[PDB]
């Protein structure tokens, strides 16, 4: 909140219930967001690339999934 110049947890923001111009909201990553993708050792210029985020809603999956053709960038 810019008016208070402090950060707030939404668990206690039930009564405010709204945002305003000049407010900063930290929101979860969604499909279509751009994410930096890196593999150590970072030897090449392409070792750090920006991919578009595809969020896998299945909770059983904890890996980073990327196309096999994309491995050549990271030598992975």
């Amino acid at each position: 909140k810019q008016i208070t110049q402090s950060v707030h947890d939404i668990e206690g923001l039930k009564q405010d219930f709204r945002l305003e111009v000049g407010d900063i909201l930290y929101r979860d990553v969604v499909t279509g967001d751009v994410a930096f993708f890196n593999r150590q050792p970072s030897l090449e210029r392409s070792s750090i690339g920006v991919h578009r985020i595809v969020v896998l809603e299945n909770p059983k999956i904890s890996t980073f999934q990327m196309n096999v053709s994309a491995c050549a960038w990271y030598n992975a």
Binding site: R39, Q40, P41, A76
Partner: protein, 48 residues
């Protein structure tokens, strides 16, 4: 000559190699020192 109290305690450790006196300050040719890779991601270096 039969006293064992004042013996060099480091002498009991019998040397295990040849050049334990040979000293040269050089980088270990297997040391990952100038490559900046974290401990857990050292598995990336594993061949296949």
């Amino acid at each position: 000559g039969e006293d064992s109290s004042m013996d060099d305690i480091s002498a009991y450790s019998s040397p295990g190699l040849f050049g334990e006196d040979i000293i040269d300050r050089l980088d270990d040719p297997f040391s990952i020192e100038d490559v900046d890779i974290s401990l857990d991601v050292l598995d990336n270096l594993a061949p296949q």
